[PDB]
Amino acid sequence: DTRFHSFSFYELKNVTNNFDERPISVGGNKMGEGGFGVVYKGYVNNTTVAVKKLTTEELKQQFDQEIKVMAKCQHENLVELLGFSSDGDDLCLVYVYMPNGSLLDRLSCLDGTPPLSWHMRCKIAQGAANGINFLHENHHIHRDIKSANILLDEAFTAKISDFGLARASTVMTSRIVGTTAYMAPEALRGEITPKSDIYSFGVVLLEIITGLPAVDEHREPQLLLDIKEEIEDEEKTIEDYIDKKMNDADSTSVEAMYSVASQCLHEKKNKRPDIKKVQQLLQEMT
């Protein structure tokens, strides 16, 4: 019993051009994808929507968790679920359309979008921290904080997405989930704690500052979190790493954001700031 709309799988099929997997640029409907499904642009009730079409019973479990979590969690910095479909060939989740896609894609300037300014990145960092704070205050652990899970609306406001693996908040688990290049050491060992979301958020902050992905094989070092070491050893400077695709960054506020990222990335979970402290530091930054 939720306020979400039950759609016919056939209507979602019809409005996405039969789930046309080609990218939007070449005439299709595919906007992106991530582990459990493909995300399509649709048009329902005169409204643009995003339709995510999703092992086995575990997939139904992530569909149910996404719905249960979204019913309990509504906030300015969380993506809004509109409805779902379970009556056809496959499970679908329907959301408000995010015209600016994901932070990951906007940082890479995917499809030719202009680089995000430093002014916009600071607003995005603050928004995402506000969304995590809401989750934590409501005893939820996201478990998959990453730039692909921070969406951007019509005003480039950060909207946290993908609540399929979210947990009710420390304990251990037999099923270790998350994205390795963003995971805290205790999460890779099976610990479940909101302290891990802070670590993953530190990685997202490093992506915002540098414009670099969390992992790059043909790059060296391959993992972004390792720059914290290059810098502390005075081998490099955060300045050497600032994204060159901005014309408005200023050293002081960049260094304040790097300081927050550095505190988030403490290897010892108990030494990390909690989300309230992170929100505060990002507010003083601006």
Ligand SMILES: CC(C)Oc1cc2c(OC[C@@H]3CCC(=O)N3)nccc2cc1C(N)=O
């Ligand atoms: C709530 C999700 C389904 O909504 C979207 C997701 C997207 C996306 O997703 C990348 C990954 C996989 C799913 C996810 O949440 N993170 N990449 C690119 C564009 C996306 C646009 C929307 C949207 N609501 O318009």
